């Protein structure tokens, strides 16, 4: 079985690689773009205003081999803020394609 410790190791490397992208990817065409971010789960690129942003299921998941073409989603609003969940400050995401 896929152990906690190996998943944590993979997660750390995912985060490492993401942080490198956050620092090294060129700035977005406009400040109207939604901003790149690591949310502890996935690495998000900058987003075009009024569009959906997609990223692959994080490869550190124990079941990543079962969801090889799955994607997780955010929505970048026309004001360059990531779409938020009501009440909260938290961003809307759809992770359903990456469930076990």
């Amino acid at each position: 079985t896929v152990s906690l410790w190996e998943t944590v190791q993979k997660w750390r490397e995912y985060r490492r690689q993401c942080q490198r992208s956050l620092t090294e990817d060129p700035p977005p065409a406009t400040d109207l773009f939604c901003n790149r971010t690591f949310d502890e789960y996935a690495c998000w690129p900058d987003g075009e205003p009024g569009s959906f942003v997609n990223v692959s299921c994080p490869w550190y998941l124990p079941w990543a081999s079962s969801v090889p073409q799955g994607h997780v989603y955010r929505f970048c609003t026309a004001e360059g803020l990531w779409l938020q969940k009501d009440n909260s400050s938290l961003p809307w995401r759809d992770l359903s394609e990456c469930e076990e």
Binding site: T1, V2, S3, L4, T7, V8, W11, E40, Y41, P62
Partner: peptide, 26 residues
């Protein structure tokens, strides 16, 4: 049927899966 090895495997797998859930929900 279900064996003692199944339950111990399930428990270990669950450790990783809870970590994933801590990542997500938060």
């Amino acid at each position: 049927g279900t064996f003692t090895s199944d339950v111990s495997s399930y428990l270990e797998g669950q450790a990783a899966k809870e970590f994933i859930a801590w990542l997500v929900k938060g």
